[PDB]
Amino acid sequence: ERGWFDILDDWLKRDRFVFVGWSGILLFPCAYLALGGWLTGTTFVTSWYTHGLASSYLEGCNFLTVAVSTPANSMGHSLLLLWGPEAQGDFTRWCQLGGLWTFIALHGAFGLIGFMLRQFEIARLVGVRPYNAIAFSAPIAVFVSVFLIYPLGQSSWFFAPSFGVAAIFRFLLFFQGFHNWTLNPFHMMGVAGVLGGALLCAIHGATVENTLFQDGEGASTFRAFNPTQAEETYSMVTANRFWSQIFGIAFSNKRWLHFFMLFVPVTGLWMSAIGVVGLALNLRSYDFISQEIRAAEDPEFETFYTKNLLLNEGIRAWMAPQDQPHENFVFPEEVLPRGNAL
Amino acid sequence: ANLWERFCNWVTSTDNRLYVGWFGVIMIPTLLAATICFVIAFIAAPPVDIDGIREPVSGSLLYGNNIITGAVVPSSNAIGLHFYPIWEAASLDEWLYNGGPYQLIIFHFLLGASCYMGRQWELSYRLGMRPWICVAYSAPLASAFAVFLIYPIGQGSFSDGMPLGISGTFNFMIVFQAEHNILMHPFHQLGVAGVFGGALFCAMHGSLVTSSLIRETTETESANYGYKFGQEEETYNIVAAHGYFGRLIFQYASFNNSRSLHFFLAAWPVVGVWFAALGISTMAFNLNGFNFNHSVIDAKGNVINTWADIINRANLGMEVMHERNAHNFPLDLA
Amino acid sequence: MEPNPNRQPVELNRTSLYLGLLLILVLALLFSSYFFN
Amino acid sequence: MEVNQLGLIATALFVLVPSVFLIILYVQTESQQK
């Protein structure tokens, strides 16, 4: 066996500055097109016809306010392919209809697949366990749930996140006001996983950096490490005693420690993905029924929960007409919910 | 040895199951007082007139909350930044109505946690360690200081401190968005880069090390038994790990120095969260997120909305609804 | 009957017990509010 | 408060079933030969 396939395999897997692999055939074009799509849209392309929004540097937006915006609600869940029945091959019209959003979302998705496949391929070639890819399953769950599944359960891509800084903030605040997303225990687990992951990152880093063995004469201690050295660079025993006496418990097993470091943020993101999947269907954690029955019967009964619902109602009524222009909302001043004075 | 000498020897003893230490001498009672008061209040405290408008908010379990909705409610806006210990009240009933538990708890907590940090230094010193774990801990602590003390100071009231509860937390966050456009503040953005980044690098590091564990076990047992506590040799092959990650991106984007790697792991989330905390602590003095409201205008002068303006509409909804009975005048100035 | 050679002993160490109980109890503390609704 | 009257048994079994599974596994682990 030494045919064209094996030869191609040879070239694809050569040790070069940027590894390519079979995975690269999928990854590089899709990732390049996704990033370039985003830069192109944010630099030059409007959202006037889809959102009534300026979204490019060309229109005067800045880095924080530029976006590639979702298509108009009327597009439904159209793939919005350049050659599709909407743009009919006209690139300018395609841009104006929001075709760059689906371009970026789909290429981004196949690109993520490419990257994880890359992780597998490289892991196989180097002869390591493929835990990095497995860990990467969490960002993919998040992307798929938020940018694909979520809008697929709603009316259209319009309500997917638009690719932009401020656009993403809007997405957050929308989820608060309409989904009460903070109240969702799956989101709560996501938060726990992210903050817990950052905690583990920081605390482990600091612990290692402050239990180092003196392995050199330098006061700057980084040089006193050799990549090939057999010895642990820091004291697990001392670290363990420190945390046992400080916090009450401590790691004693380095392998467990690092697996745990994989487990926490990955699991968190996966839980959040599940919650967002629920939000695709408006299957929210919006209310506690007992709270509402009591509050409905007892106008002196007040919790932070009801305060937050008042905030949500505000968000919805004040943001909806401009945020959802396809609904043609007109809310007279007198119907707008407002407290005293404000 | 005399009694004081013996006492000092015990306090600073490295052989106590939990290290006490001099920072611990302050930490233990303050945290115990804070914890006990917190638990009792969370279960049984009556409603608190947080905004000083005789509109009591129920925080406790027995007064109709669940775990998610429950809180210890901030002290009354009528109190402001005034010191409200139990003994300044005519009665415990009064103290409870006005949100005294909140003050007692947050002040004991902040003192106790500051002492927790000092205690981390202290034990590091007793054990002959390098001293900076506590510096890492300075990141979450500062953040607590940001939300329990500094923001109240800037706004003029502990009624504006973050409530000690989950939904109360969400309340604090939403109001904060309305009043400071925190999302559009670069320090909060740095906070987010810090925590997202922290979780990414946590997962990443965990995965690479797990990926490069040296085979020491059979398939019918957990791989963790392949490492024994205190062994001299490393349990994973970092050269292999680097060989993988370097090819995943490119050689020089990969750490080969484990000390440099772990320093980066320490520094990224800690610095990011320091920025988050300074975000809250400076928005405390109303230097707020970027305002691009009506920044884009056409040739005639028509406002061309951007995503910033939609954000602004949501913010408006929050602004106009929050504390619906507290405002008599048109501008919310603190 | 002739015994099955595929049999393996099963283990859960104390640390894993504590971790598991922590997971279950904290999950319960989180979701209970939603079960009671 | 007008709570769901199954919340109690739901929470109770949610806590108890997996906790018990783990306790069983731990205890039968301890009793194994050292």
Binding site: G248 | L61, F229 | R14, L29, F36 | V3, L8
Partner: peptide
């Protein structure tokens, strides 16, 4: 009954903290 449940779970968590700290399996250098 809700309150009893919540406080119960919490109490179990604290007890768990106690056992996890003072009755942990001790780390042993081999």
């Amino acid at each position: 009954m809700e309150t009893i449940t919540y406080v119960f779970i919490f109490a179990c968590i604290i007890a768990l903290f106690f056992f996890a700290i003072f009755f942990r399996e001790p780390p042993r250098i081999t």
